[PDB]
Amino acid sequence: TYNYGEALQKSIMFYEFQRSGDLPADKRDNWRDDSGMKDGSDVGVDLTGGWYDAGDHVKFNLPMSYTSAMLAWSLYEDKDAYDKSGQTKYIMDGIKWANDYFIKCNPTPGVYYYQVGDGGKDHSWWGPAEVMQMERPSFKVDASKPGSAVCASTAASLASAAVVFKSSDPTYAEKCISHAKNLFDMADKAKSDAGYTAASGYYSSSSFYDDLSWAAVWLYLATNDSTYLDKAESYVPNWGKEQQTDIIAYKWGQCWDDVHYGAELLLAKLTNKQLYKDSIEMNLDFWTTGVNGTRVSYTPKGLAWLFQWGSLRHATTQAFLAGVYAEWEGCTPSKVSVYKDFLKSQIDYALGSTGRSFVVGYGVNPPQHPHHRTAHGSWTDQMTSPTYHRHTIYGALVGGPDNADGYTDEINNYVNNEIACDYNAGFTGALAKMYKHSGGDPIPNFKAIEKITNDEVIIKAGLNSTGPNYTEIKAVVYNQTGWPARVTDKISFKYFMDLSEIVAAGIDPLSLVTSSYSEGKNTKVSGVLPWDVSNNVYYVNVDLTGENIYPGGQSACRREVQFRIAAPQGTTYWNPKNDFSYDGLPTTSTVNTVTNIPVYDNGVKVFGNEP
Provide the annotated active-site residues: 56, 371, 409, 418
Identify each DSSP E strand in 499-603 by its residue range: 513-515, 524-525, 529-532, 537-543, 558-566, 592-593, 599-601
Query: Closer CB to Ca ion, residue 17 or residue 582?
Result: 582
The whole-angstrom separation of Cα 329 and Cα 268 is: 11
How many alpha carbons fall within 13 Å on the CB side of residue 551? 26
DSSP characters over 111-124: -EEEEES-HHHHHT
Min dist CB 536 to Mg ion, Å, is: 6
What's the distance, CA 347 to chain centroid?
Answer: 23
At 237, the amino acid letter reads P
Q: Give me the least distance between CB of 355 and Mg ion, in Å please.
A: 17
Half-sphere exposure of 268 (CA within 13 A, CB side): 24
- Tell the smallest beta-carbon distance from residue 533 to Mg ion (Å): 11
Minimum Å gap between C-beta 535 and Mg ion is: 6
Q: What is residue 55's three-state secondary structure?
A: coil
Contact partners, residue 537, CB within 8 Å, separation at least 6: 496, 497, 498, 499, 531, 580, 611
Residue whose C-beta lies closest to Mg ion: 498
User: Nearer to Ca ion by C-beta: 211 or 381?
Assistant: 211
**Contacted entry of Ca ion, Mg ion, none for residue 211, CB cut-off 5 to 8 Å set by kind:** Ca ion
Least spacing, CB of residue 579 vs Ca ion, in Å:
5
Choose from Ca ion, Mg ion, none: what does 332 bind? Cβ within 5-8 Å by kind.
none
Q: For Ca ion, give the closer residue by CB, 160 or 488.
A: 160
Residue 532, strand partner residues: 537
Q: 194: how many CB neighbours lie within 10 A of its CB?
A: 13
Q: Which stretches of 56-147 are assigned E, i.e. beta strand?
A: 59-60, 112-116, 138-141
22, interface contact from Ca ion, Mg ion, none, CB < 5-8 Å by kind: Mg ion
Between 345 and 368, CB nearer to Mg ion: 368
579 interacts with, out of Mg ion, Ca ion, none, CB within 5 to 8 A per kind:
Ca ion
Q: How far is the CB of 535 from Ca ion (least distance, A)?
A: 12
Determine how many CB atoms are found less than 10 A away from the CB of residue 200: 10
**Residues 146 and 196: beta-carbon distance below 8 Å:** yes
- Whether residue 356 contacts residue 364, with contact meaning beta carbons closer than 8 Å, is answered with yes
Q: Please state the φ and ψ torsions of residue 281, each to the nearest 5 degrees.
A: -70, -30
Under 8 Å between Cβ of 528 and 510:
yes
> CB under 5 to 8 A by kind: which of Mg ion, Ca ion, none does 281 bind?
none
Q: Which does 210 bind (CB under 5 to 8 A by kind): Mg ion, Ca ion, none?
A: Ca ion
Q: Which is nearer to Mg ion, 21 or 323 (CB)?
A: 21
Q: Which partner from the list Mg ion, Ca ion, none does 207 bind, CB cut-off 5 to 8 Å by kind?
A: Ca ion
Residue with smaller CB distance to Mg ion, 22 or 610: 22
Write out the residues near Mg ion by the rule CB under 5 A.
22, 498
CB of 367 within 8 A of CB of 467? no
Closer residue to Ca ion in complex, CB, 211/418: 211
Residues that bind Ca ion (CB under 5 A): 149, 207, 210-211, 498, 575, 578-579
**Smallest separation, CB 57 to Ca ion (Å):** 24
Q: What are the beta bridge partners of residue 60?
A: 115
Nearest residue to Ca ion on Cβ basis: 207
